[PDB]
Amino acid sequence: MMNNKVSFTNSNNPTISLSAVIYFPPKFDETRQYQAIVLSHPGGGVKEQTAGTYAKKLAEKGFVTIAYDASYQGESGGEPRQLENPYIRTEDISAVIDYLTTLSYVDNTRIGAMGICAGAGYTANAAIQDRRIKAIGTVSAVNIGSIFRNGWENNVKSIDALPYVEAGSNARTSDISSGEYAIMPLAPMKESDAPNEELRQAWEYYHTPRAQYPTAPGYATLRSLNQIITYDAYHMAEVYLTQPTQIVAGSQAGSKWMSDDLYDRASSQDKRYHIVEGANHMDLYDGKAYVAEAISVLAPFFEETL
Amino acid sequence: MMNNKVSFTNSNNPTISLSAVIYFPPKFDETRQYQAIVLSHPGGGVKEQTAGTYAKKLAEKGFVTIAYDASYQGESGGEPRQLENPYIRTEDISAVIDYLTTLSYVDNTRIGAMGICAGAGYTANAAIQDRRIKAIGTVSAVNIGSIFRNGWENNVKSIDALPYVEAGSNARTSDISSGEYAIMPLAPMKESDAPNEELRQAWEYYHTPRAQYPTAPGYATLRSLNQIITYDAYHMAEVYLTQPTQIVAGSQAGSKWMSDDLYDRASSQDKRYHIVEGANHMDLYDGKAYVAEAISVLAPFFEETL
């Protein structure tokens, strides 16, 4: 067995089934009980993209891994489609973990989690509330709340983001009035909308053959915005984020301040930070050598912490 | 009219219908646009209990009011029953407001909200993220996160609440294994369980004909505990809670400190605090004179701010 594609009931909301791929380690032996890693995808991303890449690479290193599509996203169930409820994205991880505990070849006591981009933020948040998570890893970490409220370069004061909470609120009014769901960009929806080359690379990832995938349109429901602005992925990290934490950020990443934020706020005794030289935010999604370096740091981390 | 019971699709989760009761003011004219107030109920409470009492009496004072059952609770839909996901309890208020915007006789620009006990905390949270809420009021306010993490008396260090986070996490494992849901009391399930008179009065309210209602069993799903511990109903109040805020609490209330916390944290230029002398937490639920006083502060407040 190389991998398994499954759908399973989301224990948080049994009307929804999550779609996921489980990758098995080499010489997989079902009589054994393995360390396992849950992989959460970027904002607007799906299990076939970078998260799947990291899932597969990790499983090559002796773990059972799982890459799932978030509720309302990818091949997972749920309406409205492309909802970006950060609390739900966070709880999804706990649902995937429940699923894992149903598998005899997973050790419930050796389960970890990593995410990329927004998926990292959510992973952090998961680790805070779900004590079954033994260790976490992040790649190009995004605290979605921070990025939408204070800006890509953290130069917007939170109060000045008030018009965004208003827009998300008013969208709920339009949504019920029209019967449609107003949408908003995650990665830029048009190449020219990108304000810098990194964000242009994000557009490029989602809207060109670099990694475009039909279940990843690259927008979210606007109604989520008001919750996103008032969201903090690291909320209470100083108290509860105690699990071992491995951070991986590029040297040229314009998002690195969020990895810095996670690192500084984490209560963890064992918190680590690996800088990838020369890489920007998007570089870690799919640059062969970059992904290889990130794996070379993450796998021994999980091997020793799980 | 006077009194109309309704059910409507929860716009945040269309598989769920909310049950609610709309109360109409004296000489209600449906061709007119009214000020409206959303009433949110205590933890473990329902619309037929104290929330419906406040809704009725506020409607007497000229408002259209609505008392609803939270998703997963009362007569509202959703499984598992008695879920106390604090993010969902908060978002429910936005779903209720969405419903109000479809009613021609309510003025979208004049909607306020109030809650009792935990529903007050949720109201605060709602005001932070839903800018359609123009003013808020609270009675015996509880920030459910605070009460579960730091205790009824605010004397438990947050880190010391870790075994409760663990307990909510492990509940998820046992829930999926057993096909059932572990539960936890909200108010004491037994008179003997009550460590003091105020909490015994909570028991009496929920489990004797004082105010027992069969859709209100008085427990929550244990799985929610981990989210509740890591929750703060007033998260970012210092930034976004700018709306006029009217606080009402009893001088004898052991929960008064959470009203103190709300008042202090709120950015609001117009924040008020009315103490009801001689009242405890539970007295404000159903004591004739105490309720009457609360209403005598709340009605003119909403009158001024909506």
Side-chain angles (χ1 to χ4, degrees):
Chain A
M1 301 255 38
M2 303 309 298
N3 76 63
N4 270 5
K5 187 174 191 197
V6 304
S7 72
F8 57 88
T9 296
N10 187 321
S11 81
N12 306 330
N13 180 353
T15 66
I16 297 186
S17 298
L18 298 177
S19 172
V21 179
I22 310 169
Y23 302 81
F24 303 107
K27 287 144 81 174
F28 172 67
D29 170 27
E30 55 181 338
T31 76
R32 288 171 63 182
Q33 302 210 19
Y34 295 81
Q35 309 139 300
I37 308 170
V38 178
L39 272 99
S40 301
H41 58 62
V46 295
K47 70 194 181 291
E48 290 82 0
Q49 297 166 325
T50 182
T53 293
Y54 277 81
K56 197 177 63 160
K57 298 291 193 186
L58 283 180
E60 283 167 0
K61 244 75 173 151
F63 310 88
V64 167
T65 68
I66 181 162
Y68 67 100
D69 291 333
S71 298
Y72 307 103
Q73 299 181 27
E75 295 183 326
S76 288
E79 305 274 346
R81 300 313 291 170
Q82 326 304 149
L83 193 80
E84 193 69 25
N85 189 328
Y87 308 111
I88 295 183
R89 290 278 268 115
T90 293
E91 217 191 5
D92 276 346
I93 291 163
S94 298
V96 180
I97 292 172
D98 297 346
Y99 175 74
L100 289 190
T101 71
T102 74
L103 307 170
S104 53
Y105 50 82
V106 169
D107 195 319
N108 299 350
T109 68
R110 310 180 81 185
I111 298 177
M114 63 153 287
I116 301 134
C117 183
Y122 295 139
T123 300
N125 186 340
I128 280 168
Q129 63 181 27
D130 194 330
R131 306 316 296 188
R132 298 171 302 176
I133 287 167
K134 196 180 185 180
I136 64 175
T138 72
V139 169
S140 295
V142 169
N143 183 327
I144 198 171
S146 293
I147 207 187
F148 277 86
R149 183 178 59 254
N150 303 115
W152 173 253
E153 285 164 35
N154 194 29
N155 62 349
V156 180
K157 299 174 190 183
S158 294
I159 187 48
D160 289 328
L162 180 61
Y164 290 136
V165 194
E166 302 175 331
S169 304
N170 295 336
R172 281 150 192 273
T173 301
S174 13
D175 285 3
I176 195 166
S177 171
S178 65
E180 295 288 274
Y181 294 103
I183 65 183
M184 70 178 173
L186 285 168
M189 299 184 63
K190 186 168 187 284
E191 183 180 39
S192 63
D193 285 349
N196 60 61
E197 178 59 22
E198 259 179 326
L199 291 180
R200 196 203 62 77
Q201 276 160 36
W203 166 80
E204 187 182 274
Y205 190 83
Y206 294 101
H207 303 277
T208 59
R210 169 181 189 165
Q212 71 192 158
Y213 199 77
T215 61
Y219 61 79
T221 53
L222 177 53
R223 66 187 291 115
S224 292
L225 184 56
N226 64 324
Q227 289 172 307
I228 290 168
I229 293 282
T230 57
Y231 175 71
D232 178 7
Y234 309 150
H235 189 206
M236 303 190 188
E238 305 83 3
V239 180
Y240 298 118
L241 191 45
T242 58
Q243 300 91 318
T245 295
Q246 172 73 77
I247 289 148
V248 174
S251 62
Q252 314 315 120
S255 50
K256 187 164 62 57
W257 58 282
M258 282 172 288
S259 280
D260 298 343
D261 201 53
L262 172 63
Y263 188 89
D264 290 13
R265 299 171 68 183
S267 179
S268 305
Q269 282 305 326
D270 180 20
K271 54 192 190 177
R272 311 175 188 182
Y273 201 140
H274 175 86
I275 294 286
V276 179
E277 290 301 333
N280 67 14
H281 185 107
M282 297 299 300
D283 280 329
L284 302 191
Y285 283 44
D286 56 358
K288 308 292 179 192
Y290 286 143
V291 165
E293 173 178 343
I295 290 296
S296 77
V297 187
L298 290 162
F301 172 84
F302 284 125
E303 201 62 67
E304 69 180 78
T305 61
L306 300 181
Chain B
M1 293 183 284
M2 192 58 181
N3 181 308
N4 178 24
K5 155 176 276 192
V6 295
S7 67
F8 56 91
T9 305
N10 188 316
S11 70
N12 315 317
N13 178 5
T15 64
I16 288 182
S17 288
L18 299 185
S19 168
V21 173
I22 308 174
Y23 297 85
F24 305 89
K27 304 182 279 288
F28 169 72
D29 177 4
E30 60 170 315
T31 71
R32 294 181 42 201
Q33 275 176 106
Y34 292 88
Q35 308 157 294
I37 304 166
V38 180
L39 270 284
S40 295
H41 58 63
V46 294
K47 66 188 178 304
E48 290 86 5
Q49 295 161 333
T50 184
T53 291
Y54 279 87
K56 184 171 188 149
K57 294 189 176 315
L58 280 173
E60 284 170 12
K61 296 290 178 264
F63 306 95
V64 166
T65 64
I66 188 168
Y68 69 98
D69 289 338
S71 297
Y72 306 98
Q73 302 171 28
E75 293 182 315
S76 287
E79 302 286 351
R81 305 303 295 166
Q82 321 312 140
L83 195 65
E84 190 73 21
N85 183 328
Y87 307 114
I88 298 181
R89 292 274 270 118
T90 297
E91 219 193 355
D92 282 347
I93 292 164
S94 292
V96 178
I97 289 164
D98 288 348
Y99 174 76
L100 292 185
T101 69
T102 70
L103 304 182
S104 59
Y105 55 85
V106 358
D107 190 329
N108 291 349
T109 71
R110 312 179 73 181
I111 298 171
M114 72 158 276
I116 305 115
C117 179
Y122 294 133
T123 294
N125 194 340
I128 291 174
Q129 66 176 27
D130 190 334
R131 314 311 299 182
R132 298 171 300 179
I133 299 176
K134 191 176 187 178
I136 68 173
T138 65
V139 169
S140 292
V142 169
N143 181 332
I144 196 167
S146 297
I147 216 170
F148 277 87
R149 178 176 68 258
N150 306 115
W152 172 263
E153 296 193 81
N154 192 21
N155 59 11
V156 183
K157 295 194 170 72
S158 300
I159 188 52
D160 281 345
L162 191 60
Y164 295 127
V165 193
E166 293 176 12
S169 301
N170 295 326
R172 293 160 184 267
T173 305
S174 64
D175 284 357
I176 191 168
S177 158
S178 60
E180 323 282 1
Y181 303 92
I183 63 163
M184 57 178 189
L186 290 165
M189 296 298 284
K190 279 315 189 327
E191 185 171 38
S192 318
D193 295 345
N196 68 6
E197 177 58 20
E198 217 176 18
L199 291 179
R200 193 201 60 80
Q201 286 175 20
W203 161 85
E204 180 182 290
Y205 188 88
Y206 292 103
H207 301 293
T208 74
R210 173 172 177 178
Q212 187 279 333
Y213 199 85
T215 62
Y219 61 80
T221 51
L222 181 57
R223 74 189 289 115
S224 304
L225 181 54
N226 69 333
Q227 288 174 299
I228 288 163
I229 302 296
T230 52
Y231 174 72
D232 177 10
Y234 307 161
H235 190 200
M236 309 193 188
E238 302 83 0
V239 180
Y240 299 119
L241 183 46
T242 62
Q243 300 97 317
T245 292
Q246 174 74 61
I247 291 150
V248 178
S251 66
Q252 319 296 89
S255 56
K256 180 181 176 303
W257 57 278
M258 284 168 287
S259 291
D260 305 331
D261 196 40
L262 179 58
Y263 179 94
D264 300 346
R265 297 179 63 178
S267 167
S268 313
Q269 294 312 114
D270 186 357
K271 51 191 186 177
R272 315 185 191 180
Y273 202 124
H274 176 84
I275 290 139
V276 185
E277 291 296 335
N280 67 16
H281 177 101
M282 293 303 301
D283 285 324
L284 302 192
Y285 284 34
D286 58 3
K288 309 276 162 52
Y290 290 142
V291 170
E293 182 177 339
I295 296 291
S296 75
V297 175
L298 289 164
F301 168 78
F302 284 115
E303 206 62 69
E304 290 169 14
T305 56
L306 294 183

